[PDB]
Structure 1
């Protein structure tokens, strides 16, 4: 009965240190490890639930689950209801609930055969999900008991392989370790470090299968939870409340798994085009005069900058919706001037509202109080904590009245200072004291029977009381949604205030966040280690449907070095969200603050990003319309090549651009993985060392001096580019170009999506142009999928073709010889000057 292999032992003492006698008294097996692995574990006979009265309907199945022997947790729910819904060919959904009592549930809006089959074990109860095509077992919950107590749910499964990704937010390789790893989801203000619950929680994983297929599992539960991985391999979800509400996504391709997950939680929002430009911020731009010098200094040194930011500096006494009349007396004029020059403006907004001012002196608090917008305590008064301005109350973003109040405060402030988006910080919610100024009461929510592995060992640490009251439920159930709910409220507030697409960047997140907002990875150190760790983290958030993500370029905490900031700017120019931000006590790190050689390398990185913006924007359109990733790991694009599975220090933009950064000090080369095919060096395309890597699926060492980042373009792909500007207001007016990467057989395909860059409801109203580009048999053409006023007058003036094996004697554009072209026999590049329009059918040819 106790003859269970070490790797397959499921912990029967997750709640406390246990002796052999207590372990055995629980009905469990005691076998010490020989050197983590639990010593006390469940035998196969440990009491679980029994399935009874299984029945079928058009939707799927229903059954009763009954537990006869209590567990060691209090308040087992002995009778449960199972509902299995076979929702689509790719999506299976099941719930386990208490039929006698409504329990907390997360607020979320909703040959021919499915890819899955589902079977059940009777006693002990289990759900078993097979992939139909190959019979692989994807889910099998029979592997361990089902626990379902009021404040402890546990469901386990075998995993199909040792390769699993997801379960943000943590500082970790992209592929998670199955070596007895406890992953804790409890939103927490902590500078990113390994082994810790960070700012967000995403209870989703994607599991790879031998041969390159994959599936995903989403547990729709927002309670504090641990997810425990062991090397058998297997996983246990361990939550402190709510219900088991489980979605399984069948793929089979990893890209399809992500799309299927996003079909449930929401496709990524479409950012405004300007949001893809460079953003620059620090804590410490302490006046409008200083802030203005930033733009002046960037401009003088020819560095693009679309958006100027401020941190708390602008506020009056660190309070939302105010500005001080010392250094920021002329804040409105500063922002108006930014707009006059074609730039946008962003500033920090905190959730917590100063509660200490004289009554009637601070409208956000006075109005919030009147309307009852705040989270309240046991006696019904606002819970008061401590954040930047001192004593503060916390808005309840599940309360409709709070949503209306937030809209009003944002609109009123925007009437004074016309900011263009909101940077929402401190929204875990972060509290500088434990729980509240008045502590927290002693009850089961504050002192639960199972506390997940949170930093500080309590759910109150660095946040507010768990038993505090919100409109929908207690904070205990809603905590992991705090940031998400603020992001939703802010998205709506910005739509109403400005009437164009919102731009919200949030610290705290939950599953589905990307439908409303972007993310940055928080208070990272200026270290080579954190530069490297930013790659898997940005990739992870893309898999989780938050493609608008980045880290603070050059790092936030501490002092950066010139070398680190060159490499971080190079890599960071490929973050889908690119912002350099810096702490109050740090040395300056704006691009213009470095030596001339470093400035040149930083300028090159920004210039290349700006040239790529039409392509990056098209990638965001694909994310928004089809649930695609923007920055993606090699394994998403080449899953059948298992050498890609562990690669997380390279990234792709979409299908075709492979970026291989230097991520260590003192390196003048880098070794990266190249999937089978021809990869052209993007440096062979003119913008205002072998030319091609011919890979069989192999590691390649590349030169990478300080001034260089390696970027390669996949053969078979065409990328749209646009001319330069210090802002997108300027760059969007420039002529465009194509880079055409030919296969050996002369083929390539690409596309361009173009709209006005900021309007709402573009796809619904059809207010966009969409063009496909095709290379074949020594010709390049466009195909006009949709042409509207938005895309009219887009000038195509340059076409660069990579992999042209022999010099052409003539090059034609719509049947007439071009004004000129160049061919380089060494690089195999044909560069062609043309006078064409993206929105009018053309034919370019050569021979």
Structure 2
């Protein structure tokens, strides 16, 4: 009965420190570890639920689950309903609910044979999901008891391997440790550090299977939760409320798992083109005059800058929807001038609204009070916390009236200052005091029978009371959606205020956030450790459908070094969202504030990113239309090479661009993994050391002096490029170029998506140009998928072909010898001058 292998023991005392006698009285096994592993664990006979009256339906199964012996938690739900829905060949969906009471549910919009088969264990109850093709057991919930109590759900499963990623937001390797790891999902304001619940919660994992197939599991549950991983290997979901709403995504390819997950939670939003340019911010740009000098200093030193930002500086006494009449007296003129120069403007918005101002003197509060927009306490009055302005009320973004109020406050402020998006901070929501000015009542929501592993050991720590009232439910159920609901509110407000694509960057997130907004990783230290950690974290958010993600380039807290800021700018130029942001008390870290050689390296990083923008924009189009990742781990692109599985200090842009950054001080080289194939050094492509790495799938040491970041182009791919500019307003008017990386057999393929860069409903209206590029048998051609006014008249002026073994005797464009070409025998690069249009069929040939 108690003869269970150490790694397969599930904790029978997750709630408290227990003695042997108490453990044995619960009906559990007490065996101390020999040095973590639970001492008190479930025998195989521990009372679970029994399956009864299993019945078949069109599109699935239903059953009753019955528990006859109570658990050690209060309020077991003794009778449950199981619903199994076989939704698509790729997507299995099951719920476990209380048939006698509607419980809290997360608000979410909804040869021939499935990839899965499903079976059930009768007693103890379990759901068993096989991969049909190879019989692999993906889900087996029979491994531990089902707990289903009012404030405690636990469902466990075997894992198919030791390789599992997901369960944001935490500072972790991309692949999570199965060594008795407790991962806590409770949105929390805390500087990224390992083992802590951070700003967001994504209850989704992708699990790798031997051979390179994968599946995903989504628990649609927004309650405070722990996820416990153990080395058997196995996983336990432990939630403090709601229901069990489980999706299984059968892949079989890791890229298909992510797409299938995003079919449920939403495809990433399409950002404006300008959103992919460089962003520059700090706390301490304390006047329009200082803020204007940033743009002047960047422009003087030839550094691209699309978007100037301000932090709290612009506000009147740190209040939303105000600007002070000292340093920011001419705020509106500053933003209009930025626009005249072809730049955009972003500023910080906090959720909490100053509640202490004289009545009638501060419209956001006064109108919020009138319309009942705020989270309320026991007596129906606004819950009052403390944030930057002092005493504050907290908008309830589940209240439709709050959405209307937020739209009005954003539109009215935009009529004063035409800002181009919203930086939504502190939306955990973050509170400077515990719960409220008035503390919190003593009830089961504030003091629940199971408290997950949250920093501070309470649901109230750094946030508002758990028993506070929102339109849809208590904050207890809704806390992990606070940031997401604000992001939805802000997305709609910006659409109504500006009539073009919204640009929202949010601190706090939940599953499906990417449908509305991007994310930055928060208060990272200016350290080599946090630079290195930003790579796994940016990859993790791409797997979770938030591709518009980055870290504060050169780090946020503390003082950067020139060397760290060179390496951080080099790597950060490959963040899909690229912003340099800096704390109030920090030494300056704008590119122009460093030595001449450091400026050259930073300018080169920005030049290359701007040259690549048409490509990065096309990668976002694929994310938006097909649920693809933008920045992706090697294992997503080469899952059948098991050597890629633990690589998280390299990243790809899409299928073709491999980035191998230096992430350590004092290094003049970097060792990176190169999947099987040829990888061309991007340094061999002209933009305004081995030329090719021929890998069998192996580790390769690369020269990486201070002025270099290693970037390689995969053979068989074509990348569109565009000429330079200090803004995308300038760069989008330049001639374009192609970089063509030939296979040994002379083949390559690539594409370009182009639209006006900011309109709504572009794909629905067909207001875009889509072109495919094909290299074959010493020819390059375009294939016109769609050609419209927007994209017709893009000029192709340069074609660079990599892996051309022999100097050609002649190079033809549309049957005429070209004006000019060069061939380099040492690099195998053929550089061709042309006068072609992306939107008009061409043929470039050489021999």
- TM category (shorter chain) comes to over 0.9
Deviation at 1:39, TM superposition (A): 0.1
SS of 1:183's equivalent in the other structure is: strand
Deviations 1:594-647 (A, max 9, x none): 000000000000000000000000000000000000000000000000000000
Give distance in 1, aligned partners of 2:82 and 2:456: 36
Partner residue in 2 for 1:248: 248
Look up the SS of the partner of 2:790 in the other structure: helix
d(CA) in 1 for partners of 2:94 and 2:247? 7
Residue 485 of structure 1 and its aligned partner are, at CA, apart by: 0.0
Deviations 1:463-510 (A, max 9, x none): 000000000000000000000000000000000000000000000000
Task: Tell me the alpha carbon deviations over residues 180-229 of structure 1, each in whole angstroms, 9 at most, x when there is no partner.
Answer: 00000000000000000000000000000000000000000000000000
| CA distance in structure 1 between the partners assigned to 2:273 and 2:360 by the alignment | 41
State how far apart, in whole Å, the 2-side matches of 1:59 and 1:779 are.
51
CA offset at residue 58 of structure 1?
Answer: 0.7
* 2:641 paired residue number: 641
1:751-775 Cα offsets, whole Å, 9 max, x none, are 0000000000000000000000000
- Match of 2:39? 39
| Aligned counterparts, 1:132-531, within 5 A | 132-531=132-531
Whole-angstrom CA distance in 1 between matches of 2:57 and 2:595: 71
Q: CA deviation at 1:796?
A: 0.1
Residue 764 of structure 2 aligns with which residue?
764
SS in 2 for 1:317: coil
Q: Secondary structure of 2:238's match?
A: strand
Moved over 3 A (4+): none
Counterparts of 2:12 and 2:688, CA distance in 1: 64
Deviations 1:428-478 (A, max 9, x none): 000000000000000000000000000000000000000000000000000
Offset at residue 572 of structure 1 (A): 0.1
How much does 1:160 deviate?
0.1
User: C-alpha offsets along residues 511-540 of structure 1, whole Å, 9 cap, x if unaligned?
Assistant: 000000000000000000000000000000
| 1:526 alignment partner, SS class | coil
| C-alpha distance in structure 2 between counterparts of 1:264 and 1:492, whole Å | 21
- The separation in 2 between residues aligned to 1:388 and 1:3, in whole angstroms, is 57
**Shift in Å, 1:325:** 0.1
Equivalent residue number for residue 819 of structure 1: 819
Secondary structure class of the residue paired with 1:325: coil
Q: How many matched pairs? A: 847
Matches of 2:436 and 2:447 in 1, distance apart?
A: 15
Secondary structure of the corresponding residue to residue 338 of structure 1: helix
Q: Distance in 2 between matches of 1:60 and 1:383?
A: 45
**Aligned counterparts of 1:746 and 1:359: Cα–Cα separation in 2:** 74
Distance 1:767 1:213 in 2: 37
Distance 1:791 1:222 in 2: 43
Residue in 1 that maps onto 2:630: 630
2:414 is paired with a residue of what secondary structure? helix
Following superposition, the deviation at residue 792 of structure 1 comes to 1.0
Q: Deviations over 1:385-431 (max 9, x none)?
A: 00000000000000000000000000000000000000000000000
Q: Write the distance in 1 (CA, Å) between the matches of 2:264 and 2:667.
A: 44
Describe the superposition over 1:780-837 as per-residue Cα deviations: whole angstroms up to 9, x where unpaired: 0000000000011100000000000000000000000000000000000000000000
SS in 1 for 2:427: coil
**Structure 1 position 659, deviation (Å):** 0.1
Where structure 1 has 5 or more consecutive residues not aligned to the other structure, the ranges are none
**TM-score, normalised by the number of residues in structure 1:** 1.00
Q: How far apart in 1 are the matches of 2:624 and 2:259?
A: 10
Within 1, Cα distance between the matches of 2:683 and 2:763? 34
- 1:647-689 deviations in Å (ceiling 9; x for gaps): 0000000000000000000000000000000000000000000
The answer for the alignment partner of 1:806 in structure 2 is 806
Q: Distance in 2 between matches of 1:683 and 1:732?
A: 23
Q: What CA distance in whole angstroms lies between the structure 1 residues aligned with 2:219 and 2:706? A: 44
Distance 1:332 1:97 in 2: 53
Question: 2:11 and 2:571 mapped to 1: Cα distance?
Answer: 42
SS in 1 for 2:402: helix
> How many Å separate the matches in 1 of 2:387 and 2:542?
31
C-alpha displacement of 1:731 = 0.1
Provide the C-alpha distance between the structure 2 equivalents of 1:36 and 1:317, rounded to a whole number of angstroms: 48
Query: d(CA) in 2 for partners of 1:809 and 1:563?
Result: 46
SS at match of 1:118: strand
Partners of 1:58 and 1:471 in 2: CA distance? 35
Between the aligned partners of 2:282 and 2:605, the Cα distance in structure 1 is 21
Structure 2 unaligned residues grouped into runs of 5+: none
1:358 deviates by 0.3
- Aligned positions of 1:683-722 closer than 5 A: 683-722=683-722
Structure 1 Cα separation of the partners of residues 559 and 445 of structure 2: 41
- Give the superposition deviation at 1:61: 0.1
Q: For residue 229 of structure 2, give the secondary structure of its aligned residue in structure 1.
A: strand
**Distance in 1 between the 2:390 and 2:560 partners?**
31
How far the C-alpha of 1:108 sits from its partner, in A, is: 0.2
Q: CA deviation at 1:59?
A: 1.5
CA RMSD of aligned residues (A): 0.2
Q: Whole-Å Cα distance in 2 between the matches of residues 139 and 413 of structure 1?
A: 51
CA distance in 2, matches of 1:761, 1:43: 57
TM-score normalised by the chain length of structure 2: 1.00
- Counterpart-to-counterpart distance in 2, 1:389 and 1:563: 37
